[PDB]
A paper describes a structure:
The Fo-Fc map obtained during the course of crystallographic refinement of this structure showed a large residual density beside the nonheme iron, suggesting the existence of a dioxygen species. We refined the dioxygen species as described in the subsection “The Oxygen-Bound Complex Structure”, and the O–O distance was refined to approximately 1.5 Å. In chains B and C, the locations of dioxygen species were similar to those of the dioxygen-bound NDO-O with indole (side-on fashion), which indicates that the average bond lengths between mononuclear iron–Asp333OD1 and –Asp333OD2 were both approximately 1.8 Å and bound in a side-on fashion. The electron density of the dioxygen molecule at the active site of chain A was identical to that of Oxy: FdO2 (the bond lengths between mononuclear iron and oxygen atoms of Asp333 were 2.6 Å and 2.0 Å, respectively, in an end-on fashion). In addition, the electron density of CAR was not found in the active site of chain A. The average distances between peroxide O1 atom–CAR C9a atom and peroxide O2 atom–CAR C1 atom were both approximately 2.9 Å. This binding manner agrees with the fact that CARDO-O catalyzes the angular dioxygenation for CAR. Structural comparison of Oxy: FdO2 and Oxy: FdCAR-O2 demonstrated the possibility that regulation by the substrate ensures that reactive oxygen species bind to the desirable position in an appropriate side-on fashion.
In the present study, we determined the crystal structures of the reduced CAR-bound Oxy:Fd complex (Oxy: Fdred-CAR), oxygen-bound Oxy:Fd complex (Oxy: FdO2), and both CAR- and oxygen-bound Oxy:Fd complex (Oxy: FdCAR-O2) at 1.95, 1.85, and 2.0 Å resolution, respectively. All Oxy:Fd structures solved consist of one molecule of Oxy (comprising three subunits: chains A, B, and C) and three molecules of Fd (chains D, E, and F), and the asymmetric unit of the crystal contains one Oxy:Fd structure.
Residue numbers in the entry:
A (entry chain B): 1 to 388
B (entry chain D), F (entry chain F): 4 to 107
C (entry chain A), D (entry chain C): 1 to 389
E (entry chain E): 3 to 109
Write the structure that this text describes.
C-alpha cells in the first residue's frame, strides 16, 4: 500500500508486501500492556500502528477509542473529561462519545447540533487474556485471538508473566533479530548462560536437509500463520568458533537444554521453547508503535496447577527470570536491533543486505508475512483514508 | 406531502438548485440529464451547502473539502465523507418538479 | 503560493489561499514588540513571516533592515557593528548599509568596489502606535496602519497596555481558536470568571439562518476587512451541559456581561469588547513568525482622559488584568492552539476536520481571509523570489 | 551525481560539479587524525565523506575497513571484537574479516558457509606522513600522496604539528572562508595581531591586473591542482577603513610581514605563507565528514634540523602558536563558517549570493575544483552504488 | 564426472532456465539463450537466492531476491547490488544432449 | 561621444563582444541575428561578465547564477537579477558598429 519507493518494492519480488509494511500489519490483534496497568475509570493513552488510542476500564471491561476528536482533531487525552461513567467529553468544544460504540451522543456547547447521533469516533476491539491487553487494530468484527497468538500461549494451565517497554527500531528489525538462528552469538556472555548452567552454542548452523529444519505453517486449524526453525532437531550446534583454524571462542557446555524449537507467527510474535529454563516457554511480541519504534512485549510461560505454584513461579520470576533472562539475556537484543536501524532506515538495506545460510528461516518468514498478513497499515489510515 | 421546486425547464442538465424550506433543513435538487434527484443540502461531513458544489454526472462534490456523494443513492463517493446523505423523492408532474416533504 | 500539496488546495475550494498561507499574508502591518523594548542605538533581532529582521532606533525613529547580508547571506546580528550612527557594517567582509534606505554605501575591505551604491538591502516600513511597534512586512508604499488594526485601537483616548510572547503553533490555529464561538467551553474554570464575577455560558444553540450568524465587513472607511461573531444575536446561551439528559456541568452565572461583540480582522487580530471588564477592550494579534510559531501579541485598551487615569489603569493592569485575564484567562488558549498542531501539521486536517454549526464563524473568516488578503508569503520570499524566462 | 536539485545545478554552469559536491570529492587523500592518536590494537571510528570507517594499527601499520558489516549493515564498532591480531569479528553473527584486504575469511556461527572467502568488505588505503593519518577515500590504486598536499608540506625538514576538530558547516564554506582575501576583516581584533606584532590590513583588495593576482596551477609536476591569490605582491592593502570618507577603523601596523601568498588546493587544503610567523607556514584541511560537518585539520610547519629544534618548536607550539594562532586567530573562522550555513543549507545560496571583486579568487577555485576533482561522492556511494542493466 | 548430463536440448525452450543439482556440491543453473546454452553457479553471489528461480532477459539473469543481475555468458554482474562474478561452467551438446562441465572455468 | 566598436561582420550571429573602456565599466555588445545591442557588461547581481554568458534570442543569461536580462530593455528576465542593466543605444552605419557613449 505504498509506504516505500516503488523502485525498491519492484526489486524485492519475493516479499514486497513485507518490505512495504513499515507501519505494521492492520487487522491483527496486538498486546500493548498488562491488565494490571489499566484501572477502572482511568483512561490510558498509547500509540499503536501510528494511531493514538485511549483505553478505559468500565465495570471491569476494556473499551478502546481513537484518541482524536472528530471535530478539530485534538487528542481528548490532553485534558480528560469523563463526565458520566459510559462517556468521554472532549475538553475543547465538548463533543461527547460513548466508550462502547464511539457514537457522538451529545455536544455540551450545542445540544441542538445536527452532528449529534450522526457521527462516530473510531473504536477498536479489546480483549484481555493471560493478564495481557490485546487490541484488534483492524476493521470489522475481529477474528479469534488465538489466530494471532503462538501455540500454547492460551493454554488453561499456562501462567503468563512478563514485562513491556518501548524500543527504538522498526518492528521488523526486532522480529528478524529474534527469529535469527545465528544471532545467539550476541548472547554468549549473558549471565543466564553461566548463572543458569545453559547449553548454548555460538550459532545453530544449517544442517543438510534444509526444508526439514524450516516448517512453514499455513494449515493450522485456528488459522495461525508462521514458520518454525527446527535448529535443535535438524540444525547443527557450533560450539567451537575458529579463525584460520584456531579455536578463538567456545559456546556454553552447560547441562540445561533450551531453545529446541523457535517459531515466528504473524502479526509478529516469537515463541522460544523451552526457554529460559527446560520447563518454561518464552513468547515475545514486537508491536509496531510507529515506523521507528515498537513495544517489546516479553512474556514467560510456565505450567502451574495451583495458586501455591503460581506464587512460587511469581517469586522466581521477580528474583531470577525477569532479572537474569528477560533483562540479562534479552538486553543485548535491544541495542542489536538499534544497530540495524541506519542500514534499513532509507529502505535500501532491504536490497543491499548480504544474507547467508541461516537466514533461510528469515526469508521464509518474509514470504509468509507477505502472503498471509491481513492488511498493510498506511499513513492514510493514520490521517484519514483517502479515495476519489 | 410534496413541495413545488421549479419548472423542469428552468434547470439546465448538470446543474444544482437549493430548496429552502420554512422551519426545516434545506434540500438540494439535481438535474442529471433528464432525471431530477434530491438529497439534503447540508454535507454530512460538516456544514457546507452541497448546492454550492460541483455536479459531475450523478456525483456531487462538496465545496468545503472535496468529499462527494452519489445524488441518486446518497452514498459517499469520495473521502472524507462517510455518512450517507438523506435522499428525498422527486417528481416531475406536468413539466414541474416536486420534492417530497420527507426523505424516502 | 505553492506552500501546500496542490491536491489538497484543489479540495478546499472555499478557501485555498488561506490554506496555502502557511507563512502568513504578505503586505500587511504586524506588531512585533513594544516601543519600550527597543532603545536608541540598540539594534534588536526578530523573525517575521519567516524573515530575519533587525530593528534599530536612530534619533528616536525606528528603522528595519533584513537581517541577512547581501554578500554571503550571514545574519549581520551575529556580531553587530554600527560604526556610524546611520549605518551598520557586516562583521564578515565589512559591507556597509544605511539604515534609512538599505543602500550599500561603503565596503571597508574594498572602497573601490563597483558594488557600492549599486546594491540595496531590503528594508521594511516601521511605525510606532499606542506604544506598539508595527512592521509592514510588504513591498512598495504601505497603506495606513488603520487598515490593519481593529476599530478603536487607534482612538486618541485609548490607553494600550500589553504582553507579547512566542507560541508554538501556526498562526491560523491561533486565529481560529480566538474567533471560535464554542471554544468558550475551555474557559469554564478560569480564575477570571470567578474572581471577576463574569457571566459565561458553555456555548450556544444557534438561532436564525446561516447569514445571520456573522457580519462580514468588506470595507471600512480605512479599508478594514473582518468578521463579527453574531451567534448570540438569535442563539440561545447554554448554561447547563447535559449528557443523556443529565446535567453534568453548568456555566458561570456572574453579573458582569462581557464579550458583547467579537470580531476578527485581517491580517489576524481579534477584538473582544468589552473584556475582561465591562469598561475595557482586548485586541490580540497572532503574528506569523514561521510555519510553526507565532507571536501572541496581547493588548488591553481603556479610554483615559488624563495622566491620573492612565497611571491608575497601569496599576490595575499590572496588579490584576495582566495576571488574571491575559494569563489567567488566555493561558488555556495557548495549549488549546498547541493541541491542534498535529492534526493540521501534514495539512490534512484542512480536509478531514468535521465542523459543526458554530464553525460558521470560522468559515466566514477563512473566506474573507482568502478573498481579501494582500498576498501569500512563500518560502521563495524568504530565500529570494524565483523566476526563469 | 544527484546531490543537488538539477534546476540549481543548471544555473551554475561555471561550477556545477563543485556545487554538486556537497559530500566532497571521491578519490583523493584526506587527513583524519594524528598518528599519536591511533595506537597498536586500538580500533578508532570516524566518518569520512559520509562513510563510517574503522582504522586500526597492527604491527605498527595502519589499516582501514568500512565500519559496516556486509551481512545486516551494522557498525562493527558498536562492540568491537578482534579475536586474532589480523582480523575483526562482527559482534552480531560473527562474520570475520581480515584488516589487510577486508576478505570475509571466517564465520564463527557457520564455518561451512559458502559466503566465506567469497565476499570482501571495503578497504581504503591509509598512510602516515608528518605525524598525520591520511586515508585515500577512493577506488583502485591510489596516486602519490603529494598530489593532494600543498607545496612544502612534505619537505624533509618541515616539522608538522597541529590540532583537529569537528566543525558544524559543510566543507566548502570552510574552504571559501579560508581562501577569502577580504575575510581577514573578522581577524582585526585577534590576540595574535597584537601579541605577535603582525602587520595586517583590514582587507587585501584587487590590485590592477586581475588575471595576475590569481594564479591557476595545473602544470605542477606532482599533479597537484590549486589556485594562488597573490595578495602581498599584486594585491592592495586596505589599512584605513572608511564610511562616507571618514576613518572608522584601521588595520594593524606591526613589523612582522605574513600572508604574503595564499593558495587553495584540491581536495581542499589551504596554504598560508608565511604564517603565523615570518618563519612558519600554515596548512589546513577542511575534510568532509558529511553534508553538514567537516574536520578542521590545522597544521603549522616550521623547518627544524634536529631533535633539539623539534623539541623547541613543540614547546613553542603548545605555549604560543596553538593558543595564540590556531585558536586565538582561527576561532573566529569557526563561527564565521557556521554563519553561512543557513544561506547555503537549501542550496539556494549558490545562486543568490552577491559577490564582489575580491571573490574573484574563490571563483577561480570553484572552476578548478569543478574541472580537476577526481570524482563526486554521492549518497549511493554511502548506501551502496546502484545500477540497472 | 567431467561432463554432467543435464537434459535433451529439445527439453529446454529458448529463454528458460534449469537447475542442475549435484551430489556433494553447489547447484548449477543452465540457461538457453536462443539456440545457445550457458551455465553458472545457481546460487546468486549476493546472497542465498536461486537464480534458476529468477527471470532471464536475453543473456542477463535477474535474481529474484533483490533484483541483482548477471550476464549468463561471462558471469559478470549486470545489475546492483551484485558485485561478485558468478563461476561459469562450459556447456556442450553431444548428439542433441546437453552437458554441463563439472568444474568452472579458471580465467 | 559615440564609440566605434567594430565591423558588423566581426561578430557572428548570436555572439557577444566585450568592449573595455579606460576609466569606465566595460560594455557588452550583443549580435542578435543581424541586429546589434549594448548594455553594461557586468551582471548587476555580481562580478560576472555577461559577455561570457549565454545569449538566447534577445535575453542574455549570466554565466554565474543563471540570472538573465533582455538586452534590448536591460530589464531583468530571470532571478536572482533584480537591478536593471544599463542600456546603450547602438547604430550600424556603413557596416560599422557604434555604441552610445553613455547610457540612455
Ligand atoms: C535462538 C535461540 C534462542 C533465542 C532466539 C534464537 N531468539 C530468542 C528470543 C528470546 C529468547 C531466546 C531466543
Ligand atoms: C588572508 C590573509 C591571511 C589568511 C587568510 C587570508 N586565510 C587564512 C587562513 C589561516 C590563517 C591565515 C589566513
Ligand atoms: S476538537 Fe473536540 S469538541 Fe472540538
Ligand atoms: S463539509 Fe463536505 S466534504 Fe467536508
Ligand atoms: S557576508 Fe557580509 S560582507 Fe561578506
Ligand atoms: S550483521 Fe555482522 S555478522 Fe551479521
Ligand atoms: S541474493 Fe541475489 S541480488 Fe541479493
Ligand atoms: S553574478 Fe549574474 S546572476 Fe549572479
Ligand atoms: Fe536474541
Ligand atoms: Fe479563548
Ligand atoms: Fe580566517
Amino acid at each position: 500500500m505504498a509506504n516505500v519507493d516503488e523502485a525498491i518494492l519492484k526489486r524485492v519480488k519475493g516479499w514486497a508486501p513485507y518490505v512495504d509494511a513499515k507501519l505494521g500489519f492492520r487487522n491483527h490483534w496486538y498486546p500493548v500492556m498488562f491488565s494490571k496497568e489499566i484501572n477502572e475509570g482511568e483512561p490510558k493513552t498509547l500509540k499503536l500502528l501510528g494511531e493514538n488510542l485511549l483505553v478505559n476500564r468500565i465495570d471491569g471491561k476494556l473499551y478502546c477509542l481513537k484518541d482524536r476528536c472528530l471535530h478539530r482533531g485534538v487528542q481528548l487525552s490532553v485534558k480528560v473529561e469523563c463526565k458520566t461513567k459510559s462517556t468521554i467529553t472532549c475538553w475543547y468544544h465538548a463533543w461527547t462519545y460513548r466508550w462502547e460504540d464511539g457514537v457522538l451522543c451529545d455536544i455540551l456547547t450545542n445540544p441542538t447540533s445536527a452532528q449529534i447521533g450522526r457521527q462516530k469516533l473510531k473504536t477498536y476491539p479489546v480483549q484481555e487474556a493471560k493478564g495481557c491487553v490485546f487490541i484488534y487494530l483492524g476493521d470489522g468484527d475481529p477474528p479469534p485471538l488465538a489466530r494471532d497468538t503462538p501455540p500454547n500461549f492460551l493454554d488453561d494451565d499456562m501462567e503468563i508473566l512478563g514485562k513491556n517497554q518501548i524500543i527504538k527500531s522498526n518492528w521488523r528489525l526486532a522480529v528478524e533479530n529474534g527469529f535469527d538462528p545465528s544471532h545467539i552469538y550476541i548472547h554468549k556472555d549473558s549471565i543466564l548462560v553461566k548463572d543458569n548452567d545453559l547449553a548454548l552454542p555460538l550459532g545453530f548452523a544449517p544442517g543438510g536437509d534444509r526444508k526439514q529444519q524450516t516448517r512453514v505453517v499455513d494449515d493450522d486449524v485456528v488459522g495461525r500463520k508462521g514458520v518454525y526453525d527446527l535448529i535443535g532437531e535438524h540444525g547443527v550446534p557450533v560450539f567451537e568458533g575458529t579463525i584460520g583454524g584456531e579455536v578463538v571462542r567456545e559456546g556454553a557446555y552447560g547441562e540445561k537444554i533450551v531453545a529446541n524449537d523457535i517459531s515466528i507467527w504473524l502479526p509478529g510474535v516469537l515463541k522460544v521453547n523451552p526457554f529460559p529454563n527446560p520447563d518454561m516457554m518464552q513468547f515475545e511480541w514486537y508491536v509496531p508503535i510507529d515506523e521507528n519504534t515498537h513495544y517489546y512485549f516479553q512474556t514467560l510461560g510456565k505450567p502451574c496447577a495451583n495458586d501455591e505454584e503460581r506464587k512460587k513461579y511469581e517469586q522466581e520470576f521477580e528474583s531470577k527470570w525477569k532479572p537474569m533472562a528477560l533483562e540479562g539475556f534479552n538486553n543485548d537484543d535491544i541495542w542489536a536491533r538499534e544497530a540495524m536501524v541506519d542500514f534499513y532506515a532509507d529502505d535500501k538495506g532491504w536490497v543491499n543486505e548480504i544474507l547467508f545460510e541461516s537466514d533461510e528461516a528469515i526469508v521464509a518468514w518474509r514470504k509468509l508475512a507477505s502472503e498471509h498478513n491481513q492488511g498493510i497499515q498506511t499513513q492514510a489510515h493514520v490521517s484519514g483514508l483517502e479515495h476519489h | 406531502i410534496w413541495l413545488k421546486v421549479c419548472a423542469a425547464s428552468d434547470m439546465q442538465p448538470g446543474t444544482i438548485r437549493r430548496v429552502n424550506r420554512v422551519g426545516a433543513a434545506p434540500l438540494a435538487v439535481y438535474r442529471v440529464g433528464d432525471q431530477f434527484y434530491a438529497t439534503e443540502d447540508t454535507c454530512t461531513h460538516g456544514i457546507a451547502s452541497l448546492s454550492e458544489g460541483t455536479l459531475d454526472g450523478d456525483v456531487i462534490e462538496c465545496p468545503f473539502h472535496g468529499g462527494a456523494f452519489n445524488v441518486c443513492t446518497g452514498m459517499p463517493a469520495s473521502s472524507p465523507c462517510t455518512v450517507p446523505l438523506g435522499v428525498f423523492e422527486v417528481e416531475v408532474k406536468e413539466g414541474e418538479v416536486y420534492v417530497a416533504g420527507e426523505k424516502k
